[PDB]
A paper describes a structure:
[name] feathery mottle virus (SPFMV) and [name] (SPMMV) are members of the genera Potyvirus and Ipomovirus, family Potyviridae, sharing Ipomoea batatas as common host, but transmitted, respectively, by aphids and whiteflies. A common feature for all potyvirids is the structure of virions as non-enveloped, flexible rod-shaped particles, composed of multiple copies of a unique coat protein (CP) helically arranged around the RNA genome. Here we report the generation of virus-like particles (VLPs) by transient expression of the CPs of SPFMV and SPMMV in the presence of a replicating RNA in Nicotiana benthamiana. Analysis of the purified VLPs by cryo-electron microscopy, gave structures with resolutions of 2.6 and 3.0 Å, respectively, showing a similar left-handed helical arrangement of 8.8 CP subunits per turn with the C-terminus at the inner surface and a binding pocket for the encapsidated ssRNA.
The structures of SPFMV and SPMMV were determined using single particle [name] with helical symmetry, at resolutions of 2.6 Å (SPFMV) and 3.0 Å (SPMMV). Each subunit is separated by helical rises of 3.97 Å and 3.98 Å and helical twists of 41.2° and 40.83°, respectively, for SPFMV and SPMMV. The [name] density allowed residues 91–310 (SPFMV) and residues 66–296 (SPMMV) to be modelled, identifying the major components of the three domains in each CP structure. For instance, α-helix 1, which slots in the crevice of the adjacent subunit is tilted downwards in SPMMV, compared with SPFMV and PVY N-terminal regions, with a root-mean square deviation (RMSD) of 4.7 Å. On the other hand, the predicted structure for SPMMV CP showed a flanking loop followed by helix-turn helix motif at the N-terminus, not observed in the [name] structure. Considering the high confidence score in this region of AlphaFold predicted structure, it is likely that this structural motif is averaged out during [name] 3D reconstruction due to the possible high flexibility of the N-terminal loop preceding it. The RNA segments are bound to an inner RNA binding pocket, formed by residues from the core domain and the C-terminal segment of the coat protein. In the [name] virus structures, these correspond to Arg 235, Ser 172 and Asp 248 (SPFMV), and Arg 262, Ser 152 and Asp 236 (SPMMV) respectively. The transition temperatures were calculated after data normalization using the first derivative of a native fraction for each sample, and the results showed that SPFMV-VLPs dissociated at 55 °C (Tm1), while the CP units unfolded at 66 °C (Tm2), whilst SPMMV-VLPs dissociated at 60 °C (Tm1), with unfolding of CP units at 69 °C (Tm2).
Author numbering: 65 to 295
The structure:
RNA sequence: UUUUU
């Protein structure tokens, strides 16, 4: 059997609906084989490109800083801060998030930035807009680990995970789109079980009272009953 | 989907 044919017939076992049999050709197979987009650009768990750039442009206008200096200077600081403290929406009560200027592995001064103009501008929640930087956050935490002064991950410490070697997987903005092995899947997921620590209520206590009974009277008569004379 | 202050 020097030659063993070529097959490559495709389809066969794969059931094809009758409406698609006229377009489900062999040449159609090769056309869709090229459509393999990144598995981190299609899911709804992250902000889309249209609303990611909206977040980038809106927050730099509020800070009155250029996009070039935003993507270079304060974005890594924001990623580090989101590594230290969580990325929850109700972090706005801090009213300020801190960035520290570093001279040579030694703090010199802490800078203060408003936290509202960076959370509300993330249209599909800030937990989703920061998921694009989840892969960069792990690398930056590893860099901090190599420097001898590891970061303190809020999720890992809160969940009870004291392992500093892999204290990530406690990052609040990991979508798990990365090829996590089965031994890190449960470590990340048990940390994710910090959600059941606190409840959530969907609706507040309404607006003010619509009405509490009204009054309408005039003239000179009894206190409340207008000329009460019936029997 | 949200939910990890």
């Amino acid at each position: 059997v020097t030659f063993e044919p070529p097959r490559v017939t495709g389809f066969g076992a794969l059931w094809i609906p009758r409406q698609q049999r006229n377009y489900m050709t062999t040449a159609y197979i090769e056309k869709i084989k090229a459509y393999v987009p990144h598995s981190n650009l299609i899911e709804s768990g992250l902000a889309s490109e249209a609303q990611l750039t909206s977040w980038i442009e809106n927050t730099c206008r509020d800070y009155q800083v250029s996009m070039d200096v935003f993507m270079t200077t304060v974005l890594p600081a924001w990623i580090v801060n989101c590594i230290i403290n969580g990325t929850s929406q109700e972090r706005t009560n801090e009213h300020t998030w801190r960035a520290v200027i570093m001279a040579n592995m030694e703090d010199q001064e802490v800078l203060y930035y408003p936290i509202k103009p960076i959370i509300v501008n993330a249209q599909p929640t800030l937990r989703q807009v920061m998921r694009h930087f989840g892969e960069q956050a792990v690398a930056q935490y590893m860099n901090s680990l190599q420097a001898g002064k590891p970061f303190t991950v809020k999720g890992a410490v809160t969940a009870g995970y004291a392992n500093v070697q892999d204290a990530w997987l406690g990052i609040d903005f990991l979508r798990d789109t990365m090829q996590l092995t089965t031994k890190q899947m449960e470590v990340k997921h048990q940390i994710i079980a910090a959600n059941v620590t606190r409840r959530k209520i969907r609706v507040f206590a309404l607006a003010a009272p619509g009405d509490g009974d009204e009054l309408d009277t005039e003239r000179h008569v009894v206190d409340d009953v207008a000329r009460g004379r019936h029997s």
